[PDB]
Amino acid sequence: DPRAYPFAPADLVVEILDLVQQASHYKQIKKGLNEVLKSMNRGLAEFVVLAADTQPLEILLSAPLVAEDKAVPYVFVPSKAALGRACGVSRPVIACAVLRADMSQLRNQITALRTKIEQLLL
Template sequence: MASVEPEARKERRDKKDKKDKKRKHSETVADADEVEVVAEKKKKKDKKRKSTDGADAEAVMVVDTDGVKDEDDDKKVVAKVEEDDKKVVAKIEDPLAALVPFANPLAGEKDGKKVMKSVKKAAKHKHITRGVKETVKAIRKSPMSTPATLGSDVLPHGIVIIAADISPMDVISHIPVLCEDHNIPYIFVPNRGELGSAGSTKRPTSVVMITEGLRGAKKDAVDKEGEKEFQETYKELHRTAMKLGQTIMV
């Protein structure tokens, strides 16, 4: 009986040892899996951080010329981003949908620059009338002229420049009809602010009229060379108006 008891005790101890070994093996495998998962997460995080750092370095390289990143480089990066944002906003703030539906002929970007230069020279040489009221009065007082054509040497008494971003449209809707009654060419431009600036005024302007020449005391006091230069500008503006008038926009 005494010899049997140690055998049973030994068997129980062996079973316990096997269970302990099995439990330790399971815990070791679980720990290994956990370590592997953590390592994989760390690897992904490091990869993402390197990618972000690379993008930042690329942004700095755009303006970094001395190879050293400093505060000026950061300011240049911020300035470049702000400039791009302003360009996007400027494009959004100038939609063609805001123009009056009867804006025809409408000067495009290239012709619009020519028109604005002509308005600036007209303002410099005092050949300009600003505002709806004054322009309508000048059109009605202008002598009736024969209709001019492209390439013709006959110049009209005046040329009217109208801003197409006016609201309500009734403010300028009668001007094109009035111009046609007096055979005066007219051109629409997209921005009234630019028209006012070109006409040497700080306020946005709905319409201006550029006249061919001066009369009376003003004509005697004008610079002849400057007047000759303006006449060339006026002829060029007339050709632009005639060219745009041949295109019908739908």
């Protein structure tokens, strides 16, 4: 789907899902479209991850648009099911926000990845 841009190449997908898992382990994730739109508006989201196989895709298309307006880096991954697993849940997750952590190695990881995702949009 061409509206599912930027689309993370496979290596990046892996790095995203592995970091989501770690973040969710420390509750540095919001799941679901509503909480994500909200994290972005309130300046709480370091970056946003969207599921390209969301059905229909129109459900989440306000997210890239709020992200652009708030300059929150966002990226599409191919699978909402995979993203659910990484968030620690057995149902699909179509959107999630990786939150801002206090100084720590986790923050450092999150920040590093945020910069990677930033550069997709440049």
